[PDB]
Design an enzyme around this catalytic site. Structure first.
Site, PDB file in Angstrom:
ATOM      1  N   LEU A   1       0.823  -1.203   0.000  1.00  0.00           N
ATOM      2  CA  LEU A   1       0.000   0.000   0.000  1.00  0.00           C
ATOM      3  C   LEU A   1       0.860   1.257   0.000  1.00  0.00           C
ATOM      4  CD1 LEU A   1      -2.685  -1.091   2.610  1.00  0.00           C
ATOM      5  CD2 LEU A   1      -2.845  -1.091   0.110  1.00  0.00           C
ATOM      6  N   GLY A   2       1.853   1.282   0.883  1.00  0.00           N
ATOM      7  CA  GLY A   2       2.740   2.423   0.977  1.00  0.00           C
ATOM      8  C   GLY A   2       4.125   1.998   1.415  1.00  0.00           C
ATOM      9  N   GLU A   3       5.044   2.954   1.483  1.00  0.00           N
ATOM     10  CA  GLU A   3       6.417   2.673   1.889  1.00  0.00           C
ATOM     11  C   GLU A   3       7.157   3.970   2.220  1.00  0.00           C
ATOM     12  OE1 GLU A   3       8.491   1.000  -1.685  1.00  0.00           O
ATOM     13  OE2 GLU A   3       6.675   1.704  -2.705  1.00  0.00           O
TER      14      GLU A   3
ATOM     15  N   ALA B   1      10.737   5.659   4.849  1.00  0.00           N
ATOM     16  CA  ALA B   1      11.892   5.494   5.724  1.00  0.00           C
ATOM     17  C   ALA B   1      11.724   4.324   6.686  1.00  0.00           C
ATOM     18  CB  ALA B   1      12.141   6.779   6.504  1.00  0.00           C
TER      19      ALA B   1
ATOM     20  N   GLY C   1       9.907   1.607   6.165  1.00  0.00           N
ATOM     21  CA  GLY C   1      10.013   0.378   5.405  1.00  0.00           C
ATOM     22  C   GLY C   1       8.921   0.273   4.359  1.00  0.00           C
ATOM     23  N   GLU C   2       7.915  -0.548   4.638  1.00  0.00           N
ATOM     24  CA  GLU C   2       6.811  -0.739   3.708  1.00  0.00           C
ATOM     25  C   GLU C   2       5.513  -1.091   4.427  1.00  0.00           C
ATOM     26  OE1 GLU C   2       8.756  -4.166   1.631  1.00  0.00           O
ATOM     27  OE2 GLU C   2       7.000  -5.301   2.304  1.00  0.00           O
ATOM     28  N   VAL C   3       4.396  -0.731   3.807  1.00  0.00           N
ATOM     29  CA  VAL C   3       3.082  -1.022   4.354  1.00  0.00           C
ATOM     30  C   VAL C   3       2.383  -1.921   3.342  1.00  0.00           C
ATOM     31  CG1 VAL C   3       0.851  -0.080   5.004  1.00  0.00           C
ATOM     32  CG2 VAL C   3       2.928   1.146   5.603  1.00  0.00           C
TER      33      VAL C   3
ATOM     34  N   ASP D   1       2.420  15.441  12.683  1.00  0.00           N
ATOM     35  CA  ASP D   1       2.770  15.379  11.257  1.00  0.00           C
ATOM     36  C   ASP D   1       1.562  15.192  10.368  1.00  0.00           C
ATOM     37  OD1 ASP D   1       4.592  15.514   9.071  1.00  0.00           O
ATOM     38  OD2 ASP D   1       4.670  13.329   8.945  1.00  0.00           O
TER      39      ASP D   1
HETATM   40  O1  LIG Z   1      -4.895   1.106   4.376  1.00  0.00           O
HETATM   41  C1  LIG Z   1      -3.982   1.746   4.889  1.00  0.00           C
HETATM   42  N1  LIG Z   1      -3.759   1.655   6.231  1.00  0.00           N
HETATM   43  C2  LIG Z   1      -2.825   2.260   7.045  1.00  0.00           C
HETATM   44  C3  LIG Z   1      -2.997   2.441   8.448  1.00  0.00           C
HETATM   45  N2  LIG Z   1      -2.048   3.043   9.222  1.00  0.00           N
HETATM   46  C4  LIG Z   1      -0.910   3.470   8.607  1.00  0.00           C
HETATM   47  C5  LIG Z   1      -0.714   3.299   7.200  1.00  0.00           C
HETATM   48  N3  LIG Z   1      -1.678   2.694   6.432  1.00  0.00           N
HETATM   49  O2  LIG Z   1       0.426   3.707   6.489  1.00  0.00           O
HETATM   50  C6  LIG Z   1       0.964   5.009   6.760  1.00  0.00           C
HETATM   51  C7  LIG Z   1       0.246   6.072   5.910  1.00  0.00           C
HETATM   52  C8  LIG Z   1       0.910   6.199   4.564  1.00  0.00           C
HETATM   53  C9  LIG Z   1       1.010   5.123   3.476  1.00  0.00           C
HETATM   54  C10 LIG Z   1      -0.280   5.103   2.663  1.00  0.00           C
HETATM   55  O3  LIG Z   1      -1.075   3.993   3.059  1.00  0.00           O
HETATM   56  C11 LIG Z   1      -2.104   3.578   2.190  1.00  0.00           C
HETATM   57  C12 LIG Z   1      -2.142   3.842   0.776  1.00  0.00           C
HETATM   58  C13 LIG Z   1      -3.217   3.385  -0.019  1.00  0.00           C
HETATM   59  C14 LIG Z   1      -4.259   2.664   0.591  1.00  0.00           C
HETATM   60 CL1  LIG Z   1      -5.579   2.104  -0.374  1.00  0.00          CL
HETATM   61  C15 LIG Z   1      -4.256   2.386   1.973  1.00  0.00           C
HETATM   62  C16 LIG Z   1      -3.173   2.841   2.792  1.00  0.00           C
HETATM   63  N4  LIG Z   1      -3.136   2.584   4.174  1.00  0.00           N
END
Ligand SMILES: O=C1Nc2cncc(n2)OCCCCCOc2ccc(Cl)cc2N1
Length: 269
Positions: A14-16, A18, A20-22, A129
């Site tokens: 979903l994201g990444e 510093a 790491g990765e989500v 932030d």
């Molecule tokens: O579904 C989530 N949950 C979530 C919950 N808590 C922290 C986090 N993400 O990641 C940090 C935010 C930035 C990355 C961006 O994160 C996301 C990007 C795109 C989609 Cl569809 C969902 C998320 N995030």
């Protein structure tokens, strides 16, 4: 209990950054979706406290406009944080460059952002932030505050603790953080919400940073709301911004009063 209900598959990142990765995780049995934050505890000097604090703050959060916390798992040098999955994505992606978004949408998102911030401040926590990349959306476009890796407690046992650490993102940080040694936590979060409001209504940030050496900031303090970025913002929301983006943190509008503002209470618009 039902078998396999403990196994989650990683569908996509979903994201990444510093940290790491989500990754997005779906349950093998229930097919329930959740976001997994992968943080590598590599090196020991700036981590044992970092990731452990974020976890500590999360176990306290419980509000409809705040990313829910499901738990964490430790494994060697890999920490796993199970967080709420918000399929709506980032607020940042709803903002059209140089344009923004429909005023009604921005107002609803602003209301929800305020709800979350009120909750957090209410339990003595400051996010530090707030920006569109940290504000997530769920299936029903409900705004949720996320990523508490920079968050900290500013009130404990009913006693307020002034902040001194400089954190956040320059375009969103309040001026006192760059000018004073110590400052109150709450006005800092209110300022960032004002910058987020501006971005939503103009599709652009007003300045690189809140300093008198930055041309655009100086013009704001001089009230040059013509042409410049504020020209694309209606007078009602612009009047609210005039009260949020005030350099003196002690004179800046507070949340209870933002809730009394004309635009904030304007039907539709
Ligand atoms: O579904 C989530 N949950 C979530 C919950 N808590 C922290 C986090 N993400 O990641 C940090 C935010 C930035 C990355 C961006 O994160 C996301 C990007 C795109 C989609 Cl569809 C969902 C998320 N995030």
């Amino acid at each position: 209990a039902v078998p396999f209900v403990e196994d989650w598959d990683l569908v996509q990142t979903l994201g990444e950054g510093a940290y790491g990765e989500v990754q997005l995780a779906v349950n093998r049995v229930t097919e329930e979706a959740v976001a997994v934050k992968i943080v590598d505890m590599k090196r020991a000097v700036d981590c044992p406290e970092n990731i452990k604090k974020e976890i500590c703050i999360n176990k306290m959060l419980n509000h409809e406009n705040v990313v829910k916390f499901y738990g964490h798992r430790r494994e060697g040098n890999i920490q796993y944080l199970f967080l709420e999955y918000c399929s709506g994505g980032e607020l940042f992606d709803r903002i059209e460059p140089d344009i923004g978004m429909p005023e009604p949408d921005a107002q609803r998102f602003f209301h929800q952002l305020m709800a979350g911030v009120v909750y957090l401040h209410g339990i003595g926590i400051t996010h530090r932030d707030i920006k569109p990349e940290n504000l997530l959306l769920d299936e029903r476009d409900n705004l949720k505050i996320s990523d508490f890796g920079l968050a900290t407690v500013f009130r404990y046992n009913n006693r307020e603790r002034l902040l001194n650490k400089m954190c956040g993102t320059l375009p969103y940080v309040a001026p006192e953080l760059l000018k004073r040694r110590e400052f109150h936590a709450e006005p800092v979060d209110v300022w960032s919400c004002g910058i987020v409001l501006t971005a939503m209504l103009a599709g652009e940030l007003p300045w690189d940073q809140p300093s008198d050496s930055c041309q655009e900031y100086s013009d704001w303090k001089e009230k040059k709301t013509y042409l410049n970025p504020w020209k694309k913002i209606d007078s009602a929301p612009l009047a609210l911004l005039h009260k949020i983006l005030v350099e003196n943190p002690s004179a800046r509008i507070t949340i209870p009063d933002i809730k009394k503002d004309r635009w904030y209470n304007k039907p539709l618009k």
